[PDB]
Design a protein around this ligand. Structure first.
Ligand SMILES: Cc1cc2nc3c(=O)[nH]c(=O)nc-3n(C[C@H](O)[C@H](O)[C@H](O)COP(=O)(O)O)c2cc1C
Ligand SMILES: Cc1cc2nc3c(=O)[nH]c(=O)nc-3n(C[C@H](O)[C@H](O)[C@H](O)COP(=O)(O)O)c2cc1C
Ligand SMILES: [Zn+2]
Ligand SMILES: [Zn+2]
Ligand SMILES: [Zn+2]
Ligand SMILES: [Zn+2]
Ligand SMILES: [Zn+2]
Ligand SMILES: [Zn+2]
Lengths: 183, 183
């Protein structure tokens, strides 16, 4: 039998993206975003819903660029910190002891310690409010790649956010091949 | 050291939502969507990027309503099937032996066998192409709820999609509390 929980922001999985930017004085920042996901395959793009109150919002409107860094479980507390505190008057990289690595393709830093980072160019600002970034590059630690050059998600070891209950989870075991299992 | 994988639709986690609809003749359908996620907290909303070629696209434009059903690992093959084959000339519920349960709040079916189902009213069609649904209700199997009435994600046991490598994964272990661990 099902129970109704009502109209809640409740779905699984949700991501835990750290959205990286530079402010007008080139101060690097990261914030946590779970209201996000891939939106298009042409160009490859990610949508992120960022509130106007966030310092990151301002930086993206100014520079037209941002990164997404994907934490591994070792950095779950760091990621949470970035989702509690604002960078308006704090350098979170300094506070967290993390490295703001300049993007190679876009005007934004990513988190060097994290296993995976995505460089994005702002292509749409939709206003419901969402920034749409075109994926310019996806960078992954060599230690996390399979022989065919794609990532091993269990080596990346990304964090999952459970909304409402407000918890973080790891990725578990392989289940099946997509575009295959259903045949 | 990082390696560049180039401009790919590569991020983790991504969801595996089964988007449920009725066509003009009240035939129930489900398709798989991973280019999706929560977009807003007011109203609580999910964005789904559905291609014009899908039969589901047509049904959502006609009825203004859809559901999201979240498969557990037992239904990973079923979910994959729904993402390979079209419902234009096939009843996938019949093919899969699944139950199209009418929504209580919206004009769309959900998958009765799945642990969690979300009923959505179409509120925006953005055209990059995305349907924005307002969450009207979230329904969860009683067996999957904690004593406080929220779901246990490991009991729900939702599927995660790994894009490009095209694989499905389970959710693993609890890591930490959000809005807490970072303090
Ligand atoms: C798990 C989690 C998910 C979050 N998701 C979002 C989100 O999708 N959009 C948003 O605007 N804020 C989100 N937040 C809140 C911001 O990360 C938070 O307001 C942050 O302090 C903003 O930092 P900034 O002012 O330095 O940009 C989230 C926080 C956490 C911990
Ligand atoms: C893992 C996976 C993810 C998918 N994600 C999407 C998506 O986000 N949007 C989309 O238009 N198609 C997506 N597809 C493809 C559709 O599910 C597929 O075209 C389906 O046959 C459409 O069914 P319909 O014609 O009955 O609506 C996905 C398929 C799979 C297996
Ligand atoms: Zn898009
Ligand atoms: Zn698209
Ligand atoms: Zn090898
Ligand atoms: Zn929205
Ligand atoms: Zn919003
Ligand atoms: Zn109990």
């Amino acid at each position: 039998m099902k129970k109704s929980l009502g109209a809640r922001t409740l779905a699984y999985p949700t991501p835990l993206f750290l959205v990286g930017t530079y402010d007008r004085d080139s101060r690097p920042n990261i914030m946590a975003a779970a209201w996000a996901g891939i939106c298009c395959s042409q160009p490859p793009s990610i949508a992120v819903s960022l509130r106007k109150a966030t310092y990151t919002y301002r930086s993206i409107t100014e520079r037209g660029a941002f990164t997404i860094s994907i934490p591994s479980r070792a950095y779950v507390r760091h990621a949470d910190y970035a989702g509690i505190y604002s960078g308006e008057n704090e350098d979170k990289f300094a506070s967290l002891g993390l490295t703001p690595v300049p993007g190679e393709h876009v005007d934004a830093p990513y988190v060097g310690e994290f296993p995976m980072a995505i460089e994005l160019k702002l292509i749409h600002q939709i206003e419901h409010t969402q920034f749409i970034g075109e994926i310019m590059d996806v960078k992954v630690d060599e230690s996390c790649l399979r022989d065919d050059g794609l990532p091993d998600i269990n080596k990346v070891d990304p964090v999952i956010f459970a909304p409402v209950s407000r918890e973080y989870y790891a990725v578990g075991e392989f289940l099946a091949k997509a575009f295959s299992a259903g045949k």
